[PDB]
Write an enzyme that holds these catalytic residues in place. Structure first.
Site, PDB file in Angstrom:
ATOM      1  CG  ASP A  11      31.073  40.041  56.629  1.00  0.00           C
ATOM      2  OD1 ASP A  11      31.247  39.628  55.650  1.00  0.00           O
ATOM      3  OD2 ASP A  11      29.900  40.392  57.044  1.00  0.00           O
ATOM      4  CD  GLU A  60      30.833  46.878  60.905  1.00  0.00           C
ATOM      5  OE1 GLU A  60      29.917  47.503  61.248  1.00  0.00           O
ATOM      6  OE2 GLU A  60      31.019  45.573  61.206  1.00  0.00           O
ATOM      7  N   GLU A 107      20.014  49.579  65.415  1.00  0.00           N
ATOM      8  CA  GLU A 107      20.837  49.527  66.568  1.00  0.00           C
ATOM      9  C   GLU A 107      22.573  49.704  65.828  1.00  0.00           C
ATOM     10  CG  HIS A 141      27.913  40.300  60.254  1.00  0.00           C
ATOM     11  ND1 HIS A 141      28.826  41.249  59.307  1.00  0.00           N
ATOM     12  CD2 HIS A 141      27.410  41.073  61.215  1.00  0.00           C
ATOM     13  CE1 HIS A 141      28.707  42.280  59.807  1.00  0.00           C
ATOM     14  NE2 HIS A 141      28.154  42.231  61.050  1.00  0.00           N
TER      15      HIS A 141
HETATM   16  N1  GXF Z   1      28.612  44.816  62.483  1.00  0.00           N
HETATM   17  C1  GXF Z   1      27.969  45.458  63.043  1.00  0.00           C
HETATM   18  N2  GXF Z   1      28.443  46.839  63.280  1.00  0.00           N
HETATM   19  C2  GXF Z   1      27.887  47.667  64.087  1.00  0.00           C
HETATM   20  C3  GXF Z   1      28.934  48.054  65.412  1.00  0.00           C
HETATM   21  C4  GXF Z   1      29.090  46.821  66.283  1.00  0.00           C
HETATM   22  S1  GXF Z   1      30.108  47.311  67.721  1.00  0.00           S
HETATM   23  C5  GXF Z   1      31.571  47.916  67.490  1.00  0.00           C
HETATM   24  C6  GXF Z   1      32.422  48.247  68.773  1.00  0.00           C
HETATM   25  O1  GXF Z   1      31.770  49.668  69.113  1.00  0.00           O
HETATM   26  C7  GXF Z   1      31.962  49.469  70.674  1.00  0.00           C
HETATM   27  N3  GXF Z   1      31.134  50.926  70.828  1.00  0.00           N
HETATM   28  C8  GXF Z   1      29.917  51.035  70.570  1.00  0.00           C
HETATM   29  N4  GXF Z   1      29.540  52.178  70.845  1.00  0.00           N
HETATM   30  C9  GXF Z   1      30.433  52.878  71.392  1.00  0.00           C
HETATM   31  C10 GXF Z   1      30.554  54.073  71.927  1.00  0.00           C
HETATM   32  N5  GXF Z   1      29.930  55.158  71.769  1.00  0.00           N
HETATM   33  N6  GXF Z   1      31.911  54.371  72.255  1.00  0.00           N
HETATM   34  C11 GXF Z   1      32.751  53.534  72.018  1.00  0.00           C
HETATM   35  N7  GXF Z   1      32.636  52.179  71.747  1.00  0.00           N
HETATM   36  C12 GXF Z   1      31.592  51.979  71.264  1.00  0.00           C
HETATM   37  C13 GXF Z   1      31.272  48.386  70.916  1.00  0.00           C
HETATM   38  O2  GXF Z   1      31.782  47.916  72.337  1.00  0.00           O
HETATM   39  C14 GXF Z   1      31.902  47.437  70.176  1.00  0.00           C
HETATM   40  O3  GXF Z   1      33.142  46.674  70.656  1.00  0.00           O
HETATM   41  N8  GXF Z   1      26.794  45.275  63.671  1.00  0.00           N
HETATM   42  C15 GXF Z   1      26.085  44.186  64.089  1.00  0.00           C
HETATM   43  C16 GXF Z   1      25.054  44.112  62.984  1.00  0.00           C
HETATM   44  C17 GXF Z   1      24.424  42.881  62.884  1.00  0.00           C
HETATM   45  C18 GXF Z   1      24.817  41.702  63.397  1.00  0.00           C
HETATM   46  C19 GXF Z   1      25.894  41.703  64.424  1.00  0.00           C
HETATM   47  C20 GXF Z   1      26.077  40.521  65.077  1.00  0.00           C
HETATM   48  C21 GXF Z   1      26.478  39.222  64.344  1.00  0.00           C
HETATM   49  C22 GXF Z   1      26.484  38.272  64.985  1.00  0.00           C
HETATM   50  C23 GXF Z   1      26.829  38.300  66.576  1.00  0.00           C
HETATM   51 CL1  GXF Z   1      27.325  36.678  67.350  1.00  0.00          CL
HETATM   52  C24 GXF Z   1      26.794  39.285  67.064  1.00  0.00           C
HETATM   53  C25 GXF Z   1      26.328  40.486  66.515  1.00  0.00           C
HETATM   54  C26 GXF Z   1      26.378  42.890  64.425  1.00  0.00           C
END
Ligand code: GXF
Ligand code: GXF
Lengths: 301, 301
Positions: free
Chosen positions: A12, A105, A114, A255
């Site tokens: 993205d 992010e 989520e 995305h």
């Molecule tokens: N872009 C996004 N950002 C939100 C956040 C995305 S996780 C970001 C990272 O933080 C980690 N983490 C989470 N809570 C934590 C915690 N409390 N303490 C420590 N680590 C923590 C976790 O392991 C990860 O690696 N969201 C998202 C939204 C919509 C679609 C998609 C998407 C699109 C395509 C596909 Cl193929 C799959 C998913 C992703």
């Protein structure tokens, strides 16, 4: 835990170039600072922060992607500057008392579905120094009216004749499901309305459940079939080069795409009409209650 | 449990019209027969079978979609003929000793990934009468060579430069993941090779783990970057109107698309070359071991 989430986020360009441009074009924010990257993933933002002159970067992630980040940090010769810690940001022991800057992010579909905002606000309250900064610092959510009788028929009226058989009772199960998808800007029939304004310096997890009256200024006489939601992300505090991106339909695809609430009963609107309704978001997964044209529906994503 | 799976399957016209055409164009197979629909979903195949003259149709599904099927059967006034039973076909009590015909859409990506074939073969062995029939009765899996240096660079070499940072160590995690996607037929560089032939009348769950030598007749001098897999479904036994569909790249797109195995090391091939390799499928989720140009890789989906 899966590389696929990180691939789609890194590919993205609107997202990743926005963070890159904020950090590289405002290095005075990072110079000799202690920086915390909450949910660091591959470590990309930790590495931006390091190149902009960070004294120390703490990348924290709960998932197995951190083991890739440990190797990636080493390939780019930044292990001098970036320390990686595995676990929930709520749980882990940090080797500092306090941090100057938090970067993350955290954003979900429709900003809050989520989303990690909860974990970032925990990190802020635990670890942000007096007069520290959190980025991105400002977010908004907007709604916009949609006319798309063809996409509505394809998702709803479809169930009335399925290879000659009635499946009408299936419509009750489809309507309450928000759709994530890229809208044709030609199908927008209102000016957008801001329904939510978050400053990550002044919000609490309780502020993320909200109600807002809204008014949609209709720009085209048409059938309204759906309300679409999106969010704008701003980097502002102390910036000589402010950065913003939209996930709205009139901007380049991200995305996040757009979140679409299908109306069970499309209704006609007239150019110049001020369409009035009410939206409420509850945290519970996320639900969106929408009141419009004297009917109410609750959606989930 | 979710309507979304059933929507995508019902909107696949190649799939659903193939079952519709088999049943409506061969009604002598269903006339006064007892029919078992294994994993009946919305009940669409039960209803085809009823209109073709079935004495009794037993639709069985383990999921909440059966409660939609109960209502749908009633909307189409077929509850006289179609009895719906909730639970695993392995577990439930049927109100018959034996069935004349079994019908099912059991097929996963690359035919066997997260397929129901196990449950259908259980149903056959438990409930199929002496001289009964199972449909579809014949399946094949084929491989075909691919040249697409641009899609290979976009998934693999991508990780070498990510906004100026080395992420090369990520390639080890990407290569072993089969990709599901619709291939451009212009990128095919071999005749297909059949690697598996299943007759559902004569197979056992142990036959679904197999090894096959294969030979790919190269039709274009090029870099081979990937091997693609697909399957063909046949309705044959006792048919005056045989039906077949392919999920291959030279045929109309289905919700199965194609399964793609990326080569870690693309290698050059010459038109008229007979490319020799070996493929093994293990049931374990599904794994595919591929030996080609003197290297071996194991893939999962
Ligand atoms: N872009 C996004 N950002 C939100 C956040 C995305 S996780 C970001 C990272 O933080 C980690 N983490 C989470 N809570 C934590 C915690 N409390 N303490 C420590 N680590 C923590 C976790 O392991 C990860 O690696 N969201 C998202 C939204 C919509 C679609 C998609 C998407 C699109 C395509 C596909 Cl193929 C799959 C998913 C992703
Ligand atoms: N087309 C497919 N056919 C395979 C089979 C698909 S379930 C068919 C039905 O049988 C039921 N059932 C299963 N095991 C059972 C049992 N032992 N006993 C009784 N019932 C049983 C189950 O509840 C369900 O309703 N597969 C598939 C393959 C690839 C992609 C997709 C796909 C595409 C798009 C989306 Cl949005 C989601 C999924 C689907």
């Amino acid at each position: 835990g899966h590389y696929g989430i990180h691939e789609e986020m890194l590919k993205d360009k609107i997202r990743t170039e926005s963070y890159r441009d904020f950090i590289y074009q405002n290095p005075h924010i990072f110079k000799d600072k202690v920086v915390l990257d909450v949910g660091c993933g591959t470590g990309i933002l930790s590495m931006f922060a390091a190149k902009a002159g960070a004294k120390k970067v703490l990348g924290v992630d709960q998932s197995e992607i951190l083991y890739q980040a440990m190797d990636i940090i080493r390939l780019n010769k930044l292990e001098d500057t970036i320390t990686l810690i595995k676990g929930k940001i709520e749980e882990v022991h940090l080797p500092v008392e306090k941090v100057d800057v938090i970067i993350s992010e955290w954003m979900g579909y429709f900003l809050l579905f989520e989303s990690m905002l909860d974990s970032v606000l925990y990190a802020k309250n635990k670890y942000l120094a007096k007069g520290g900064s959190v980025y991105p610092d400002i977010c908004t959510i907007s709604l916009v009216a949609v006319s798309d009788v063809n996409k509505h028929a394809d998702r709803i009226a479809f169930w009335d004749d399925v290879y000659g058989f009635k499946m009408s009772c299936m419509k009750k199960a489809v309507i309450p499901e928000a759709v994530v998808e890229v809208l044709d800007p030609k199908t927008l029939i209102s000016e957008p309305c801001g329904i939510k304004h978050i400053d990550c310096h002044t919000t609490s997890i309780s502020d993320l459940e909200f109600s807002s009256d809204f008014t949609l200024k209709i720009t085209r006489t048409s059938m309204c079939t759906a309300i679409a939601g999106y969010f704008d992300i701003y980097f502002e505090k102390n910036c000589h080069n402010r950065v913003v991106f939209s996930t709205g339909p009139q901007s380049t695809k991200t995305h996040w795409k757009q979140t679409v609430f299908l109306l069970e009963k499309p209704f006609s609107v007239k150019a110049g009409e001020a369409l009035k309704g009410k939206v409420t978001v509850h945290k519970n997964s996320l639900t969106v209650t929408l009141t419009l044209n004297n009917s109410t529906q609750t959606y989930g994503l």
